[PDB]
Every structure is written in C-alpha cells, then in structure tokens.
C-alpha cells in the first residue's frame, strides 16, 4: 500500500497521474507536508531534495531530478554546451549570455546574413539590449510546410526513470503557426501558445494548428519522399541521448538515499536540409490534450510502479 503527496497543484500532467494513482485502490494522497510518503509530486522549484531519503522504512521517489535545471534554463543550458567536453556541436544554435559570465566581445567576431531573436526579434544588434536574459540566432530560413506555408515547431516528451533509462514518447506534437511568414512583422516568427494564444485564427489549415506525428510523417513521405524517422527523429534521439547523458554523473540517483524520475519536454526546429535544431528543454512540461491519457499512464508504468509494484509506448534510447 502506497502513499504520495502532491506539492504542485497546477501541474497539468501530474494532476492527472495523481488521479490515476488513487483510481487503483493502492495509492493514497496525504497532505503536502505529511513526511511519511512513498512518492513526492514536488513543487516546480525550491523542491526540498535535502529532506528526501530520511524517513526510516520508506522508499522515497520524486518526479524531479535535482540539477536538471542546468539543462532547462537557457542560461545554464548554453553554458553547458560550451563548458562540457561531451558537447564539442552542430545542432545547437550559437549562443552567449548577457547581464544588464560576463564576457561580451564574444558576440562580435561573428557579424559578417546577421539576424537574431530577442527574448529570454530584430536584425539590429542594439535595440535589443534595451531590456536592461539570453539572446541568440534566429534561423532566417526554416523548413516551411504546405498546403498553406506553415512554419512549425516539434515537442517531444522524454521520461527518465530512477535507473536513468531514457524513454522517448512515441507521440510527438507539432505546433504549427499555420499562417504565412514574411521578413523585414513579429507574429509567425514565434510558434506556440504565448504570442499565438494572446496576439495571434487559431487553427486554419487543420484542427487547432496542431499536427500530430502520423500526419506529419505522411506529409513528409508525400511532400518529400522521406520519413519522419529518417529525416528528423534520428536527430532528435541523438539530441536527447546527448543532453541527458552529459549531465547523468551529476544528477543520477543510482546510489543515493532517495530517487528521481522526471518528464522533460524537448522543443526542436527543422530547416530544409531536414537538419534538426534544439531550442529549449522544459523541466515541467504540459502535455498535448489528446495525449494526456496515454503519456500520464506511461509515467506510472515505467517511473512509478517500476519502483512500487502492484498486484510499449516509449522508445528506450
């Protein structure tokens, strides 16, 4: 008989697994501050990792990896790809880090196109720094898909259990900015639910803009004579293996007193050579509505009940 607290309430994904756990008659939600729990569904940040693994007779596990922010904030992220030997790296955009660490002449030697993207968009290396924060290069020519000239964006969901098996969810989502896309005018330059759920027509050339994988593969075959696996997913699996295995000796809970799993959202981009690029690693990712049921259950099989037995949908990397 298993216990678990919930300490992140508005966690879209984990709200659902908290549902599924109770709905097996073998898991009980205690109050946030009850210490005698089997499983923490911890808070986004300031998660008190130092207080796990200290309750006698309790196998404790939490849905977060201490140290994984180093992959998940672009400050630490960028830093990781230059500092670490295991990352040389031909799939991350060239990058630096500015404060209103710190080294800035870095940004000069490369300036002879020269367009970059402002957030943490312009071609002028001056109006940007008025923000006074990471600020880097915009793929002036992406892959652009049709019928309708829709510039898109790929999210993959990766699960990492207590054993550090890397699990790619087979269902990715493709969040398209299904409208045109021009030059210089800062609307389709940004493709998700932050400038298109407020500023930017919320699903023109299909259902809510949102291509899932079966369709995008069929398009790729018909539109390009290739498959999603070969053109992109190989590169995606390579990116995921490479990030998570860089930081493994720093966040592995193999021989420590508690244990961690965590679900990540990877956000990629493509160009026309079907080169895949990595933008951001999300440490607290929300799922795509149609997929919540299947992903949230797969979390339980592989990350939760693998450690707490009772009475595939993932590709192991």
């Amino acid at each position: 008989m298993y216990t678990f607290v919930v300490r992140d309430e508005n966690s879209s994904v984990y709200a659902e697994v908290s549902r599924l756990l109770l709905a097996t008659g073998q898991w009980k939600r205690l109050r946030k501050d009850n210490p005698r729990f089997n499983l923490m569904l911890g808070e986004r940040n300031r998660l008190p990792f130092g207080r796990l693994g200290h309750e006698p007779g309790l196998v404790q596990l939490v849905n977060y990896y201490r140290g994984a922010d180093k992959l998940c904030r672009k400050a630490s992220l960028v830093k990781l790809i230059k500092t670490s030997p295991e990352l040389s790296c031909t799939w991350f955009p060239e990058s630096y880090v500015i404060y209103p660490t710190d080294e800035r002449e870095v940004f000069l030697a490369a300036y002879n196109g020269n367009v970059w993207i402002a957030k943490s968009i312009s071609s002028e290396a001056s109006e940007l720094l008025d923000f006074i924060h990471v600020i880097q290069k915009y793929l002036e020519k992406p892959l652009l898909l049709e019928p309708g000239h829709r510039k898109f964006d790929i999210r993959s969901w990766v699960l990492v259990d207590h054993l550090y098996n890397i699990y790619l969810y087979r269902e990715g989502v493709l969040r398209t900015s299904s409208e045109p896309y021009n030059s210089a005018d800062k609307t389709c330059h940004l493709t998700n639910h932050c400038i298109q759920k407020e500023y930017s027509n919320y699903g023109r050339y299909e259902e809510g803009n949102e291509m899932f994988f079966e369709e995008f593969n069929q398009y790729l075959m018909d539109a390009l004579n290739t498959t999603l696996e070969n053109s992109i997913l190989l590169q995606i699996k390579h990116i995921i293996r490479s990030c998570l295995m860089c930081i493994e000796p720093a966040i592995s809970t193999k021989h420590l007193h508690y244990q961690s799993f965590q679900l990540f959202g990877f956000d990629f981009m493509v160009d026309e050579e079907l080169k895949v690029w990595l933008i951001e690693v999300n440490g607290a990712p929300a799922c795509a509505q149609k997929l919540y049921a299947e992903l949230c259950q797969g979390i339980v099989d592989v990350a939760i009940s693998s450690v707490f037995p009772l009475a595939s949908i993932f590709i192991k990397l």
Partner: protein, 438 residues
Amino acid sequence: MRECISIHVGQAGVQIGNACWELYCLEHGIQPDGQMPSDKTIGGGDDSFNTFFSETGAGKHVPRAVFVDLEPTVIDEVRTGTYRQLFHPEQLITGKEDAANNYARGHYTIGKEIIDLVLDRIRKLADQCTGLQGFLVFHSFGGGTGSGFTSLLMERLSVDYGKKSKLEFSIYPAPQVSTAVVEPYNSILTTHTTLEHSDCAFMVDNEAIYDICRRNLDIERPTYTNLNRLISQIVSSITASLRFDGALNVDLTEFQTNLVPYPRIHFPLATYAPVISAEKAYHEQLSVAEITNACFEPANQMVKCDPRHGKYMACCLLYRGDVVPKDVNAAIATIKTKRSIQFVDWCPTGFKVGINYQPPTVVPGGDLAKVQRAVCMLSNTTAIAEAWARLDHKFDLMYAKRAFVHWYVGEGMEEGEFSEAREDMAALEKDYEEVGVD
C-alpha cells in the same frame, strides 16, 4: 610536543570515548593497565603519542582525557570496565540526576553545579601540559547533557583558554537510533551557543553510521557498540596525525587552516572507506582507486548529503595502510573526470593528502574486518547544509505550536532563546547558500 586534552560529555561522548581510547591503546600498543612495553622513555616523553597520553613513574600511560556525565550510570562502566586502571578517578566525573534530554536543564539548571568542578578537573590536565594546543570535545547533539552542558563548557573553555583551539565531534540525531522527540530543540540550541566557540566540528549523523553498519556489515539492527566502534575508526584517522609522525594536520590549529576558511562554516563532511564485515571471510581487498572512489559515494559519508550539489572549500585525504602517492594521483586523475567535483571559484581545486603506513587497527573480535588500506576524506562541502535544513525543519514543525517549549521555560530559559537560536541557524543556512550557488 604540544598536548591535546579530550573531553567526553554525556552518554554519547563517553561511550564513543571508550571506543576511541581503546582503539588508541591497540594502536599505540598500550595495555589495559597503562603499560606500553614498546615505550622506552619511561615515565616521560616528547613523542607524538604523548600528545594524548601522559606518563607516570611506574610507566602508566594515562589518557589526557576528562569524562563528564550528569549521571553516573555510563561513566561507571568506565570505572569498572577493562580499562579501569587506564584512568585516574579524578578524570571521570558524574552528577546525581541527568538533564532528562533537556538542553535548558543541562545548560542552566544542572549546569552550574558541575561547571566549576569540571573546569577544575580540566585545569589538572592542562597544568601537566608544557604546550597545550586545545581540546577535542565529544558529545551528542540530542542529549540534555551532551547539548546543554557542552555549550556551557564551550563558553568557559573560551574564557579560560581563549588562545586554545576547540574541535568537536558531534553526534547528529537520527530516529533510527535516537531518543527524545525534542532532540531537534537541543540540536539548534547547542550549536547556536557553541558556534563562535568551536574552531572545527565533525558532525556524525547516526543515520549514516546506521546504514553503513547495515549494508556494509550485514547487521540487521546495529548496536551502539557497532556504531561507536565504527565512529572510532573515523575519529582515529582524523586524530592519527596528532598521535603519529607526520607532516599534515599535526596540530589542532592545522584543522582550522586546512579545512575552515570562515569560522562559521567549520563542519567538514567526512567520508570513510572501506567498511568490511569480519564474517565476510573471503573478501577481495580493494585498490587505492576503489577506496578513493568510495570517498565520493554519499553512502560512505558520515552525513548523508549530496556533495554534487554544492561547492568544496578544502579536501583532505588521510590514508592508512598500503598506499603510495602515485596510486593516489592516479585515482584522483580518474575521479576528477568521472565525477562532478566543483570547488569554489576562490579556492584551489586540490587535495591535501596524508599517508600513514600502519593500516587500520580493528578491535579483536569486533565487527570490522582489517583491511590492507583505508582512506578517510575530510571535505568542507556546502552540501552539509542539507543536515541543517533537515534539523531546522523538524524544529520549525514543533516550535510553531510551541510543543514541549514549557519544559525549557520551566528551567529558566525563555522562548526568545529559541527564536534567537533559530535565526542564527537561518543565517547559517544563508551562509551555506551564498558560498554554494550562483
């Protein structure tokens, strides 16, 4: 030669004292009657083992130690145990009724009846020191005596010997052993009162030693005898440099300067390997690199925490046994790659290393197998603040309802000393966070 006087306070301090001094005897070949056949300078000596032993005309080697408990029951076993002759009646000190797991009762109430007598018993030993360098105080965080009386003695030892260094071995409380529900109270109270008075304090979490004693010794429940006999090994390696020919950590002032850049952050994490069961009869003896590697597994640390998520400020390696320097830099070369080992920007990434060739002594018929080579690592890592956060939380939970506070007020203390001591620990937690993250 500069002498070191040891002070074992309370049930934990005294019982660990027995484990250490018995080990000291086995190590320096001193017998249960104080005779040291290998000792040729009869009744005198400037040898480094004389740092911990004075001598008598009859050749008796007698600890430079004072045992003090607010209650006779434990120290009595010293008075009638195998090493009764080792000690002088005057250096084992007992009160009538103990501090009943109450900091305020051991510090304030029963404190003053014994403090002037015990400092006098200390002056007896201090006076046969030609160059005393300070004291090593052993005590629990949790007991009323261990916490309350030690923080009173640490106040006076500062005033009576302000030019002397004070090193602590403190037992941090853990429910898998442990007693009072109010040990979080005694813990916060006593470190807040002892902080500015201690130069270097080795915390030993009973939880860590328990787990070690269970995994690596296949001992279902471990006894105090198990725990203490292992704590003795770690203490022995920490102290060995004062009792033996050496060049690293040869005085107590060296522990401060080698391990403690700021006086407030004077709690080095200790990691020790290997711990091998004496009933694991066929055993593959581990290499230098294997045992230096284990110094970075959390499961060998005297306090369970994750040094991977903080910075270092000093690393000390102490090897006992078949160790040569080449094997050490080869293991350090490997481990620097494999492992996240991030020092503070303003400190050298580096290890002060010491080797004694006499391998560890194990108590005949004890639980630890004797190993060909052993290491003990003293690292000043900011990840030890995890143990404060744990302690301070348990303290917050109770003190928000004032649970058990009345037992302390009833002894003269005031709720204010509670929240004063908790703000000190809040500051000690901020200190560790400054040094440790960006």
